[PDB]
Each structure stands twice: as C-alpha cells, then as structure tokens.
Amino acid sequence: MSKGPAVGIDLGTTYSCVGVFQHGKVEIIANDQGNRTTPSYVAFTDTERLIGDAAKNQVAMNPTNTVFDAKRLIGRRFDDAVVQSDMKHWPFMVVNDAGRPKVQVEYKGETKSFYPEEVSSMVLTKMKEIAEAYLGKTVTNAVVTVPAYFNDSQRQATKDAGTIAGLNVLRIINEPTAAAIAYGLDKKVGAERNVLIFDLGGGTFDVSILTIAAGIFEVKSTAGDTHLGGEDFDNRMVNHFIAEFKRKHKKDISENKRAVRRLRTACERAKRTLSSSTQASIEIDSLYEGIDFYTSITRARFEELNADLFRGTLDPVEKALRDAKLDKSQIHDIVLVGGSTRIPKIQKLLQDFFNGKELNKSINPDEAVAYGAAVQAAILSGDKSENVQDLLLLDVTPLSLGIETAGGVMTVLIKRNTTIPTKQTQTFTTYSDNQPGVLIQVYEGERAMTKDNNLLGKFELTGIPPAPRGVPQIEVTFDIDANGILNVSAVDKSTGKENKITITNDKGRLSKEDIERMVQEAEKYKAEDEKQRDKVSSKNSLESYAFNMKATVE
Numbered sequence: 001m002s003k004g005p006a007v008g009i010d011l012g013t014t015y016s017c018v019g020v021f022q023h024g025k026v027e028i029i030a031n032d033q034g035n036r037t038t039p040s041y042v043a044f045t046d047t048e049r050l051i052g053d054a055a056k057n058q059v060a061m062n063p064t065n066t067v068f069d070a071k072r073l074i075g076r077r078f079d080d081a082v083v084q085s086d087m088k089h090w091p092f093m094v095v096n097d098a099g100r101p102k103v104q105v106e107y108k109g110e111t112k113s114f115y116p117e118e119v120s121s122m123v124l125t126k127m128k129e130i131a132e133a134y135l136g137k138t139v140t141n142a143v144v145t146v147p148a149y150f151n152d153s154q155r156q157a158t159k160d161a162g163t164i165a166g167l168n169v170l171r172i173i174n175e176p177t178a179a180a181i182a183y184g185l186d187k188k189v190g191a192e193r194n195v196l197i198f199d200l201g202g203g204t205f206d207v208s209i210l211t212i213a214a215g216i217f218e219v220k221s222t223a224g225d226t227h228l229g230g231e232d233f234d235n236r237m238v239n240h241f242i243a244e245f246k247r248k249h250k251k252d253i254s255e256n257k258r259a260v261r262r263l264r265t266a267c268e269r270a271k272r273t274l275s276s277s278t279q280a281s282i283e284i285d286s287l288y289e290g291i292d293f294y295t296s297i298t299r300a301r302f303e304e305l306n307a308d309l310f311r312g313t314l315d316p317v318e319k320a321l322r323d324a325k326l327d328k329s330q331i332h333d334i335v336l337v338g339g340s341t342r343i344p345k346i347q348k349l350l351q352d353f354f355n356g357k358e359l360n361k362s363i364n365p366d367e368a369v370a371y372g373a374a375v376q377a378a379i380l381s382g383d384k385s386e387n388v389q390d391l392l393l394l395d396v397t398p399l400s401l402g403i404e405t406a407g408g409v410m411t412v413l414i415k416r417n418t419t420i421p422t423k424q425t426q427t428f429t430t431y432s433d434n435q436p437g438v439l440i441q442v443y444e445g446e447r448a449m450t451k452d453n454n455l456l457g458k459f460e461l462t463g464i465p466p467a468p469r470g471v472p473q474i475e476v477t478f479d480i481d482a483n484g485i486l487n488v489s490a491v492d493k494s495t496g497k498e499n500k501i502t503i504t505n506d507k508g509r510l511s512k513e514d515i516e517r518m519v520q521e522a523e524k525y526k527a528e529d530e531k532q533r534d535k536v537s538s539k540n541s542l543e544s545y546a547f548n549m550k551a552t553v554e
Contacts, residue, residue: 006381007131007142007167008374010175010367011120011158013071014202016040017370018127020135021378026182028367028374029134031126037366038130041068042122044107051126060261063091065105070123072226073101073116074161075154082226120161128165142167143377145369148174148208149222152524170380175199175369176208177217179337182372183360186215187387190394192417193332194220194324198317198350200340203229207316209324209331213417214396216515219523221324223316228309230271230340236305237267237297241282245293253288262287274299275342303345310345314353328354336361337368395420398510399518401478401486404441404450406431407536408547413478416446423479427493431540434466438474438541440490442503446522448529450547459501460544461490474541480505 010017015037019028028036033053043055043066050058059066069090076083078096087094093104095113102113124144131139144167146158155172162169173181176197180186185195192213199206206224210217241263246252253259262284270280278299287293303310321328336359340346351359363371379385387393396419402412405428414424430438438461445453464472473493480486489500522529 004137004140005135006170006374006377007128007139008145008178008370008372008377009124009127009142010145010178010370010373011071011123011127011161012037012040012201012369013069013204014040015366016123016127017367018131019367019370019374020131021374021383024384026371026374027134028364028370029130031130032133036364038123038126039068040070040120040123041066042070042119043067044105044112046106046109049107049122051122060257065092065107067092067103067105067114067119070103070116070119073103074120075151075157076101076116117157117161118164120158121164124162124167125165128167140166140168141170141377141381143170143178143373143380144172145175145178145373146172147206148176148219149206150174170377173373173376174208174217174219175206175337176210176219176222178370178372178376179335179368180210180212180217180333180372181376182363182368183333183335185333185335185360186212186217187385189213189215189387192396194326194330195333195335196317196320196331197335197337198341199224200313200338200346201229202339203227203231205229205313205316205338205340207320209320209326211417214394214398215512216519218519220326221320221322223320223323225312225316228312229338232309233302233306233340233343234264234267234271236309237271237302238264240297240301240305241267241293241295244295245288245291249288249291251288251291256288259288270297271302271343274302275344299344306345310343310349313346313349317350317353331357334359335368337365339366341365395484397480398515399444399454400446402443402453403476403488404439404443404542404547405536405538406540406542408450409532409536410443410445410448410450410453411539413476414480420484421480421482423477425475425477426539428474428476428539428541429470430464430467430472430543431469432543433469435464435469435472435543437462437464437544438472438490439544439546440476440488440499440501440541441546442486442488442501446518447525448532452521452525456486457488457501457503458546459488459490459499461492461497461499462544463495463497464492465494470540 008019017037019026030036031038038052039056041055043050072086078101094101095104104113128139144162159169179197180195195210197208205228208222209220211220266282266284273280279296281296284293396417400412400416401414402410405411441458442456443450443453444456447453475491475493477489484505486503486505491498
C-alpha cells in the first residue's frame with residue numbers, strides 16, 4: 001500500500017509550489033527546469049498549450065493568450081465588481097457564460113473559453129506531474145491550500161480544479177494555517193496561542209490572526225491588500241530609473257517596450273540583492289538609443305522609494321489586530337510568508353511594531369505554505385503525530401459554554417480553551433416586569449444565536465419576587481470539575497433560593513472533526529454574527545420561554 005504518498009500544494013496567484021513529506025522530512029519538488037516554484041500561467045499558441053515557466057517566458061509575444069491571476073476569479077460570478085475591476089487590468093478576455101466567468105483565447109487557431117477552475121486544473125496538472133517526476137509513481141492524494149477569506153463557493157471551485165486534474169483533495173486548509181503548521185505552531189499545545197500570519201507575495205498581501213489551542217485552528221481576523229506586492233516595489237525602482245535616464249540623457253525610454261522590459265528585469269534582480277546587501281548594481285548595455293546605463297541604488301533609496309508602500313503594511317496589521325479584539329502584546333507568534341518578506345525594511349517595521357519580538361522566518365517564505373500543506377497531507381495518510389502519550393497534556397473546553405439571554409442570543413460563560421477545573425459566574429435580571437421566574441438553558445457552540453448552537457440542558461428558576469423589570473438578580477454559575485462534569489446553578493440573590501442541573505460532558509461525544517467543523521462555521525458566519533452582536537442589549541433571561549416560540553418573517 002506504498003503506491004503514492006501525500007502531496008501538499010500551495011496554489012498561489014502568481015506562482016505555485018508543491019512539496020511532499022518523505023522520510024520524516026519535507027521536500028519541495030523542483031520542476032523540469034530546476035525551479036522550486038512554478039508560475040501559475042497557461043499560454044495558448046497555434047501549436048501548443050504552455051504551463052509554468054514556459055508559458056510566462058513568452059507572455060511578451062502572446063499577451064492576449066497567456067492567462068494568469070485565475071485565482072482572482074475562482075468561485076466568483078461574472079458580475080462581482082471585484083471581477084469587473086480586475087478584468088480591466090488583463091490583456092486576455094473574460095466573458096460571461098450564463099453567470100460565471102470564462103477566459104477566452106485563440107488556441108491552435110480556434111477560439112476557446114475556459115472556466116477558471118479549469119485554468120487552475122491546468123496549473124495543478126503541471127504541479128501533479130512535477131511531483132510524479134520526482135516520486136516516480138502516480139500522484140493522487142493532495143492537500144490544496146487557499147486564502148482564509150475564501151468562501152464556500154471559492155473553496156469548492158479550488159477543489160473542482162484538483163479533481164479535474166485527477167487529484168483527490170483530502171482537504172482544503174487555509175494558507176495562514178498551513179503556514180503555522182509548517183512552523184509546528186499547533187504541536188506546541190499548552191496555553192491558548194495567538195498567531196499573526198504576515199503574508200506578502202508578488203502581488204497579494206494578507207494578514208491573518210489565528211488562535212490555536214488543543215491542535216484546533218480558529219481564524220480570528222483577516223485583512224490585507226489584494227493588489228499590493230513585490231511587483232509594485234520593482235515598479236517604484238523602474239520609474240525611478242526611467243526618470244534618472246530622462247534626466248541624464250534627456251531621453252524617455254518609455255516608447256520602446258523591450259527597453260522597459262530589460263529595465264524591470266534588472267530592477268527585479270537588484271531588489272533581491274538589496275535584501276542582503278546595502279547596494280545593488282545596475283548595468284544594461286545599450287539600454288535605449290545605443291546608450292549604456294550603469295548605476296547603483298542603495299537599500300536606503302530603495303526604502304525611500306517604497307517608503308509609503310512599506311509603512312502602509314502596518315495598517316492591515318492594525319486593522320486585523322482590532323477586528324480580532326486584542327492588543328499587539330497578545331500575539332504569541334509572528335510568521336513571515338511570501339517572497340516580499342525578505343526585504344529588510346519590511347522586517348524592521350514588523351518587528352519595531354511589536355517591540356522587537358522575534359520573527360519566525362527560517363523556512364523559505366515562498367515555500368512555507370506549500371511546506372505546511374505537505375505536512376498536513378502526511379498526517380491524513382500515515383505520519384507519527386501522537387504527542388498525547390508523553391504524560392498529561394492541558395485539558396481545556398472543546399466548545400464555548402453559555403446560556404440563552406432574551407432574543408435567543410448566546411451569552412458565553414466559559415469560552416472554549418479555558419483551562420479545565422474552573423468555575424465562572426455572571427449575573428442576570430428578568431426581561432419583562434414582575435417575571436415569575438427565569439428559564440436557564442445551557443448551550444454549547446461558537447455561533448451568536450442559540451439556534452445555531454447545541455442545547456445541552458435546561459432548568460427553570462421559579463419564585464422570583466415580583467419586581468420592576470431589571471431588578472431581580474440571578475447569579476448563574478458554570479462549574480467544571482477535573483473529570484469534566486459541568487454543573488450549572490442559579491441563585492436568586494435576594495432570597496438564597498437555588499436550582500441546578502448536572503450535565504454529563506463525559507464520553508467522546510465530539511471528535512476533532514466536530515470542533516473544527518463548528519469553529520469553521522463560526523468564522524464563516526462572522527458578520528451576520530458580529531452584526532447580530534447588536535440585536536438586543538444586556539444580560540437578561542427570557543420570561544421562561546426558549547426562543548422556540550413562533551418564528552416570524554424575513
């Protein structure tokens with residue numbers, strides 16, 4: 001049963017990467033031309049379909065038929081605005097075939113249209129063969145990564161792209177998570193940990209704040225820039241020089257395209273140099289009108305030229321940190337991913353922002369994602385990962401615990417991940433005037449409304465002395481002992497009367513899967529939720545009725 005291990009793939013916008021976990025080590029597969037990453041390009045000519053390095057190298061000559069940025073369409077509807085705004089930036093065509101987009105090209109003389117998922121399948125196919133060449137055995141099982149903001153639609157389209165290329169997609173995990181996995185930030189289990197994934201690619205920038213605990217991943221917030229990346233920084237260097245030329249020789253090399261191409265390439269190499277040297281040389285023989293161009297930029301002017309672009313970097317970090325509701329100091333880990341994160345200045349800013357905290361960057365930033373996806377791929381096929389046999393780990397709550405408050409809303413008493421033997425208490429009041437009593441109803445789950453969580457038990461507390469709405473004081477208590485049992489009790493603070501219910505939290509009633517499946521939903525609905533997070537107000541208990549009364553309109 002050793003006919004094909006597991007394959008991890010980072011389906012990136014501009015480039016893609018495929019690695020594999022073999023012999024207790026991750027290995028990033030180089031392609032047929034020696035590259036670790038492969039351009040996500042698919043060119044169509046009158047004699048063949050090109051993919052990867054080969055397609056991209058001829059883009060200059062066959063612009064209208066060399067497609068790229070398919071990841072920006074995947075799962076979307078032709079009328080999506082994001083799509084309408086992007087189309088305006090591409091050489092090739094996008095047509096609307098019954099609601100969904102299709103790139104149209106001239107292939108072998110004929111006009112052809114392709115769904116995005118297919119364009120991607122072509123990328124995954126070259127990726128698949130890259131692996132099969134290295135492994136010498138057919139590749140079938142693969143983990144494909146995707147951005148955290150992607151919606152169900154996009155996830156399924158990314159998944160269809162793999163099955164179209166004969167790939168069985170074990171699972172789709174988020175790029176921020178895959179990154180964390182590559183750095184084994186999950187296997188560090190103990191206290192709850194917050195992780196900020198700082199991803200700066202060739203043209204995409206994404207910030208993610210993850211909370212890991214008990215090997216479970218929850219996406220707290222996402223933020224970034226969908227049109228910012230390395231390319232942009234090179235541009236800053238390219239115009240710099242165009243001007244410098246026009247100023248030295250009173251000649252604008254803009255007319256000539258090849259001149260510009262040559263310029264942009266020289267700058268691309270200089271940027272790389274600048275990440276590890278304080279200067280970079282620029283030598284182009286007969287750049288424009290026979291004129292030779294020989295100069296050199298200092299990291300300082302490079303930084304000066306992208307000054308705003310670089311600092312702007314922290315805004316999405318700040319935003320993300322806010323939407324995640326926590327201070328910079330509450331971040332346990334910072335992870336660097338994306339080629340652009342090699343730029344000294346970017347690192348300086350990120351680190352000076354966190355007061356010198358150490359940055360996780362040892363793993364090639366371009367491979368981190370493909371790397372982790374490869375690691376996650378093994379575990380789902382056969383890989384030693386039983387850390388729960390050394391002694392006694394840290395027992396925390398699997399799912400948030402709580403009670404229904406007027407309106408049918410969830411009010412947590414003990415959020416998930418709280419150490420195990422703890423008792424949390426909170427006070428409530430009646431909703432309407434002279435309320436007979438309150439209905440205590442224990443709920444579990446991570447969603448905002450109780451209808452979206454699981455009901456574990458309920459008990460009433462009658463005998464509340466008639467009082468103006470908001471006067472009675474009921475002290476609810478959630479007590480969880482060592483062995484995991486939950487005891488929910490309510491006390492009317494004006495009399496001493498109480499009532500309790502013991503809930504059997506014992507038995508593997510929740511597998512790793514259930515938790516995740518549920519956390520994923522909570523983040524998939526973080527909006528309807530963070531917005532429903534304003535429906536009513538306060539902590540008051542319903543007139544002794546579960547929100548299982550008559551539902552109304554839309």
